[PDB]
């Protein structure tokens, strides 16, 4: 599914992400924009052989199982395919664990390079929330 901007803001708020770990909704929407362009089915192979999945490009090295990432873990206890569903619950649940891991949203390199410190409220501007 390709979400619209305000549509994803609303879904993320219903699933408890707004202000989670102190990160406002616009930070989450901005991270999803640059990680996946709001497409739940986005997948991208990393240099190391791991793969990033879903709207928040969650990596199989640590977080999910795809069966083809040696030596990796599965800390969200999910198949990585769950992260490609039109229902964002598994991506949000797993993102909550990632953003609690110590480095906040810096775990998403596109957030650090494209969102951090910018006017992220623009991402929710206009949305009936
Ligand atoms: Cl947009
Ligand atoms: Cl919703
Ligand atoms: Cl929804
Ligand atoms: Cl709904
Ligand atoms: Cl915001
Ligand atoms: Cl990498
Ligand atoms: Cl694996
Ligand atoms: Cl398995
Ligand atoms: Cl594990
Ligand atoms: Cl499975
Ligand atoms: Cl599995
Ligand atoms: Cl599996
Ligand atoms: Cl399994
Ligand atoms: Cl399985
Ligand atoms: Cl949803
Ligand atoms: Cl939903
Ligand atoms: Cl933080
Ligand atoms: Na894994
Ligand atoms: Pt909804
Ligand atoms: Pt499995």
From Swiss-Prot:
Organ and tissue specificity: In the egg white and polymorphonuclear leukocytes.
Key words of the record: Allergen, Antimicrobial, Bacteriolytic enzyme, Disulfide bond, Glycosidase, Hydrolase, Secreted, Signal
Gene Ontology biological process: cell wall macromolecule catabolic process; defense response to bacterium; defense response to Gram-negative bacterium; defense response to Gram-positive bacterium; killing of cells of another organism
Enzyme Commission number: 3.2.1.17
Assembly notes: Monomer.
PROSITE patterns: GLYCOSYL_HYDROL_F22_1 (PS00128), GLYCOSYL_HYDROL_F22_2 (PS51348)
Localization, UniProt: Secreted
CDD domains xref list: LYZ_C (cd16897)
GO molecular function: beta-N-acetylglucosaminidase activity; identical protein binding; lysozyme activity
Note: Lysozyme C is capable of both hydrolysis and transglycosylation; it also shows a slight esterase activity. It acts rapidly on both peptide-substituted and unsubstituted peptidoglycan, and slowly on chitin oligosaccharides.
GO cellular component, one term: endoplasmic reticulum
Catalytic EC class: hydrolase
Reactions listed under catalytic activity: Hydrolysis of (1->4)-beta-linkages between N-acetylmuramic acid and N-acetyl-D-glucosamine residues in a peptidoglycan and between N-acetyl-D-glucosamine residues in chitodextrins
Function text: Lysozymes have primarily a bacteriolytic function; those in tissues and body fluids are associated with the monocyte-macrophage system and enhance the activity of immunoagents. Has bacteriolytic activity against M.luteus.
Main localisation: secreted
Classification via SUPFAM superfamilies: Lysozyme-like
Name listed for the protein in its UniProt record: Lysozyme C
Occurrences of domain C-type lysozyme (ranges): 1-129
Binding site for substrate: 101
Positions annotated as active site in the UniProt record: 35, 52
Similarity field: Belongs to the glycosyl hydrolase 22 family.
Source domain of life: Eukaryota
């Amino acid at each position: 599914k390709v979400f619209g901007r305000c549509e994803l803001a609303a879904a993320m708020k219903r699933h408890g992400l707004d202000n989670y770990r102190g990160y406002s909704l616009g930070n989450w929407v901005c991270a999803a924009k640059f990680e996946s362009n709001f497409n739940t089915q986005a997948t991208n192979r990393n240099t190391d052989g791991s793969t990033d999945y879903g709207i928040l490009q969650i990596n199989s090295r640590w977080w999910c199982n795809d069966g083809r990432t040696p030596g990796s873990r599965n800390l969200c206890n999910i198949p990585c395919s769950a992260l490609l569903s039109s229902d964002i619950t598994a991506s949000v649940n797993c993102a909550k664990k990632i953003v609690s891991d110590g480095n906040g949203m810096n775990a998403w390199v596109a957030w650090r390079n494209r969102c951090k410190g910018t006017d992220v409220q623009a991402w929710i501007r206009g949305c009936r929330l």
